[PDB]
Amino acid sequence: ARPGGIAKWIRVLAVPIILVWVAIIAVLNTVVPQLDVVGEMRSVSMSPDDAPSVIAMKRVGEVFEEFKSNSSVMIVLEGEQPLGDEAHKYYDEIVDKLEADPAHVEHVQDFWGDPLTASGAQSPDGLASYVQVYTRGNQGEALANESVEAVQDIVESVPAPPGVKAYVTGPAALSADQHVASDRSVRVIEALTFAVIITMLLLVYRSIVTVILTLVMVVLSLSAARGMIAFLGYHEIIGLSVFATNLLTTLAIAAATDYAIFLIGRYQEARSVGEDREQSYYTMFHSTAHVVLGSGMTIAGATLCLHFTRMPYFQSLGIPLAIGMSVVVLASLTMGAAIISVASRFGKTFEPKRAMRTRGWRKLGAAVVRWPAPILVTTIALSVVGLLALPGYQTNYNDRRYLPQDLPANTGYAAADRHFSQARMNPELLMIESDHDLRNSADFLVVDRIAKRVFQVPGISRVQAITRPQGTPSFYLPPETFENPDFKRGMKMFLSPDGHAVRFIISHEGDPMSPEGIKHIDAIKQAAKEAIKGTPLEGSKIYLGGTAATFKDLQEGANYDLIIAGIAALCLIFIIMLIITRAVVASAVIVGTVVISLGASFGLSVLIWQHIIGLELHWMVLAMAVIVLLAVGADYNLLLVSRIKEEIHAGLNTGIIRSMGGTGSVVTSAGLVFAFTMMSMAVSELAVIAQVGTTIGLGLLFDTLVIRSFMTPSIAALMGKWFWWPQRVRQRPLPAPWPQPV
């Protein structure tokens, strides 16, 4: 290791760069609110603006002149006794208070107040009544969360009568409640992650000073990442989401401590070999700074590949995670190296307290090298056997199950399900827009035909329109019925103010939150299109909005999203690996090992969550787990391959043996720390974040146990000379003459 270059500059300027990093962290944390706060007040929309459901709902609002945003909250009144006159007075007071605040409540569909449609809102047993409130701001946005909070405060403000409790639930309320749950659980998840890191680094290094300095580096890097991301979010320069905040905190802390483990372990190995403090630090830098920078490039690129996606919950993981991980890696490479440099001059802080465990790892590497084909076949089979979870894997999108049951939205859903069906609480808005005036008897009979056709669609339980104020009432409207004040009120409740469009409230028979409702949306659109056929108003628009349409858009987008993001992250990680190792075959080997490890991770995570936990795996879990696995597993394989490349000089097979012996403890410690920090997400109240963390933790446990330790070295041993193509490498070097006796 020549004492020069960037390592020299970091060593000589260690104190100035430590001070600069500390000052940057302080500025970022004192000029901008914390990450949790900014994530709360700069959350990103649940659904993309260009999605057909969002534009359909916006069109509904602007045509009916009621609302301008895609967010609805269900207010459910549940009484022990049947809802009588006192319940009506309480509900009317709630509606009046909601209408008194237009900053958060855009519109209220007073279905229950009108006696014409009152029985539509009431439950069949007559114990609960639901009312729709279109709030302000698109679902999942910070404005929508504020509107949901305002609605909840308004509901709690009005004194309820004896009995009859009012709950606020619904999709926007569900998103607000998921932010609330994340705010509740972020402290405990960070505490658990830090405790796990403290304990496991204490087991690894067995030095109190070393672990304190490692946590100093980790805390400073994580605070720098949180400060940078908060600075970006507070200035609206990037989007942000609850998933982004939680995943970024955990990824930042875990990757920062992984880089700390890499640098510290390499420095300790260099010290144990016999190199002095300066020489050991220079060897550590020249052998690990490049691999840490490449690890960070892979993580940042894999996360950034989620920016080229379409849904906001992944666009919010694209740029924020990319920049957060990039600043974590700069913090590691600069601040951690500087701290190692300054601590080297002080006492024996970073001197290893015990001989590093190589004999076992050297033995394992020898076993891998001598018999690479059997070991590779065994690990390939043991990692592909995970793919047995495909016949039975489910991707339930129901956020009800992934949130605490004590939250306001979950309690509202629970109260609704006690008197209504599960589908009623998430209705669907359907329209047809007639170019001419729609208040005609022929038009009304066409509307009745449309309602009947949508009702006849399988999986649809209730249709509500001007012709059917409730679920179920040669249909002709006499012209004197048009002048009925009750019928005029029903008109203004169900028709456009200019009389050119209708609205249909659709309640499914099954879960509207699952692929059944996803197919129901297309069936409803087809039924409406065939019903409007052969009518004087043929050619109208079939804008349909609501939960099931939104998740139909999200489901198709998520399939294409996972495919394209996986392909792009895979290709970009391979490009980074080719840049680092300058070996296309080695990079492809890293790609293959990580992909197979990901298959095993999928199998194990699906098995645990869907069979012993009992909770179906969330859809966004797949994307985040795939991205993080392709990042970190490739990072570990890259560290091993870089060590192998360094050790090639003494031989190819013995190079693998020496590399495995030298990096087994380091990679095992780093992988255990990362995996355990990710399984620390299991304590998070967001069961989707828990699923993401457990999936990634199990995957990286599998990686650092079998994949990087057997599959990658066995593949390297099998390929031999071709493992470093196109770089001209040799097999076992020229046989040296037997040395003279000493």
Binding site: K363, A367, R370, A650, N653, G655, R732, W738, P741, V742
Partner: protein, 83 residues
Amino acid sequence: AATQEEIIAGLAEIIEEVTGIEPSEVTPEKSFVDDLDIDSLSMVEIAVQTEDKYGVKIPDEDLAGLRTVGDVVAYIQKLEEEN
């Protein structure tokens, strides 16, 4: 053809890496793991190291019966002398 001492010294140097046993503790009259506590998988490590950096051939079939360093050095010589 290298004499006894050359291969003994080379194997001692390799053993210093596999385990940490001092080179002068590797003498032909004493034995392997039943004497020096060098596991059969560490014997595989010796085999791989000597394949690589000395360029000799040692298969797994003959490695099982290699129970003294005298036997392994005799095997090296017996593979060496005939070109």
